[PDB]
């Protein structure tokens with residue numbers, strides 16, 4: 413049974429609600445982005461209308477085999493009428509294809525559903541500037557002040573400078589980057605660009621990247637691993653054992669691995685600056701954990717909400733414990749008292 417925070421009142425709509433069977437009253441199912449916790453339940457046998465971005469609809473057709481007749485892609489930043497209701501899709505600054513959804517209810521209520529997002533001051537100049545929002549369905553993944561991390565641009569600077577130094581010192585070093593979903597593609601594209609290389613990967617991952625509308629992608633990636641000195645592997649293989657096994661397979665081309673694990677936040681963020689980050693090392697293998705986030709930090713989240721001034725907030729993450737729900741409610745009230753709405 414579908415939980416209340418996935419239903420949009422006064423509509424026939426649900427958001428990210430594919431694992432509940434046939435939801436009573438639902439005439440259109442929205443999907444904010446192609447991450448497994450959100451698409452859970454979709455498959456080639458789904459027979460109701462799915463509304464999403466063009467990039468999400470490419471992934472639905474090629475990776476999940478949803479039939480074409482049920483995929484309804486909408487352009488961004490464009491007023492569209494769905495089943496008699498005005499909607500707008502906005503870029504979420506999450507992974508490729510990820511959107512926020514504005515719903516203009518027939519009674520005059522305006523609802524923003526953020527999906528998963530990394531809030532940014534640029535959103536203060538989208539179509540959100542132009543009218544009031546009554547209800548906010550909010551990605552609260554990092555809603556606590558302990559959750560700090562650097563900008564994406566600082567993290568990519570660190571990765572590029574680290575990889576370029578290592579490979580210039582040792583031209584026989586291989587760089588490996590971990591992945592387990594879409595998102596975070598800048599990590600491996602930025603490193604391969606400084607090295608003058610394509611990124612090498614499995615056929616399965618190449619197929620996924622080919623659905624993302626990245627400019628000039630054919631110039632940037634390949635399935636020919638032998639031609640590439642940046643390799644992608646499953647996140648599970650980014651450990652000393654898995655990396656040793658991979659180095660064996662490269663036929664003595666390489667004598668060292670430098671690997672990256674993009675994570676979200678980790679407790680080593682509560683002590684160490686990005687500049688001071690060091691790897692774990694065993695022999696000729698070194699592994700960096702880098703804090704590349706596609707979700708709002710606490711401060712980014714608080715700025716967005718204090719600018720938007722919603723009348724009511726419904727969290728969509730960390731909703732399963734009383735302690736989490738009470739913590740989030742306290743911060744929402746602080747923010748409103750501080751800003752005066």
Ligand code: NI
Nearest residue numbers: 445447506528
């Ligand atoms: Ni996500």
